[PDB]
């Protein structure tokens, strides 16, 4: 039926409706630090979230996100790898039902407790929509999360998901600062590759970070009381929403830091 993370419906069935899953620049991948080139190339990453207007939280069966006015230059991204500004749209996460899983990539095999995703579109091409039809229509800034001392920007959004508990839940969420959700450095590896869920385009250019950012044991155990299920069916905790790593194929990682 409509795709998920169960044994049923899972990352193993989705090619059967979405035939790209099986394409040559799919996501997420394994990042092996000993093979990834160092570009010195590669320019800084530019990060200008200081007019962020956030708008809503809803939860959309698969994960929870935070949404963005787009409809001007609020919150850019530029630099790095990048040719052009990309406006921020919503960022969410992917966790699992313990601590030693939950992000889509890996560095050298090892997965993070979870996954941030800030997803940023291609401003020449006018709207999301379009975007998703061009190589490099969208940016997503990957930053991992692991277990330890509390993310204190974190807070806002752990307090209001009670409040989205269900699929098609949403509450006001303004005056959030994604600010809070970056780690000290901006070392980044970046490659081509796709969307980690249907309809998995492959339109993605992806910058993950090196430093992973820290959440405390109760900050991602409240994420992990969603769930996938609608108001009036069957309770499905919300977990292990994550894809697992595909082949690099013909592709190259490169590291902007030595
Ligand atoms: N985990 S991830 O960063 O790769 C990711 C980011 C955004 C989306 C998304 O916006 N879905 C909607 C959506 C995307 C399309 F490409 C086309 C239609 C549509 F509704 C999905 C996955
Ligand atoms: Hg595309
Ligand atoms: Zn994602």
């Known amino acids: 039926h409509h795709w998920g993370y169960g044994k049923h419906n899972g990352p193993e069935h989705w090619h059967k409706?979405?035939?790209?899953?099986?394409?040559?620049?799919?996501?997420?991948?394994?990042?092996?630090?000993?093979?990834?080139?160092?570009?010195?190339?590669?320019?800084?990453?530019?990060?200008?979230?200081?007019?962020?207007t956030s708008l809503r939280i809803l939860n959309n069966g698969h994960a929870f996100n935070v949404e963005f006015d787009d409809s001007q230059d609020k919150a850019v991204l530029k630099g790095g790898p990048l040719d052009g500004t990309y406006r921020?749209?919503?960022?969410?996460?992917?966790?699992?039902?313990?601590?030693?899983?939950?992000?889509?990539?890996?560095?050298?095999?090892?997965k993070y407790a979870a996954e941030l995703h800030l997803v940023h579109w291609n401003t020449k091409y006018g709207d999301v929509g379009k975007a998703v039809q061009q190589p490099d229509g969208l940016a997503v800034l990957g930053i991992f999360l692991k277990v330890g001392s509390a993310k204190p920007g974190l807070?806002?959004?752990?307090?209001?998901?009670?409040?989205?508990?269900?699929?098609?839940?949403?509450?006001?969420?303004?005056?959030?600062?994604?600010?809070?959700?970056?780690?000290?450095?901006?070392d980044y590896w970046t490659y081509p590759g796709s969307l980690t869920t249907p309809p998995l385009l492959e339109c993605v250019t992806w910058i993950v970070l090196k430093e992973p950012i820290s959440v405390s044991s109760e900050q991602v155990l409240k994420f992990?009381?969603?769930?996938?299920?609608?108001?009036?069916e069957p309770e499905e905790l919300m977990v292990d929403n994550w894809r697992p790593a595909q082949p690099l194929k013909n592709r190259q990682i490169k590291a902007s830091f030595k």
Do not use: M
């Open 155 to 186: 807070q806002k959004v752990v307090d209001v998901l009670d409040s989205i508990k269900t699929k098609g839940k949403s509450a006001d969420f303004t005056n959030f600062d994604p600010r809070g959700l970056l780690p000290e450095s901006l």
């Open 224 to 232: 992990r009381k969603l769930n996938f299920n609608g108001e009036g």
């Open 88 to 110: 921020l749209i919503q960022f969410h996460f992917h966790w699992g039902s313990l601590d030693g899983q939950g992000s889509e990539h890996t560095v050298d095999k090892k």
């Open 17 to 52: 409706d979405f035939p790209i899953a099986k394409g040559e620049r799919q996501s997420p991948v394994d990042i092996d630090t000993h093979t990834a080139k160092y570009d010195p190339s590669l320019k800084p990453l530019s990060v200008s979230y200081d007019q962020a």
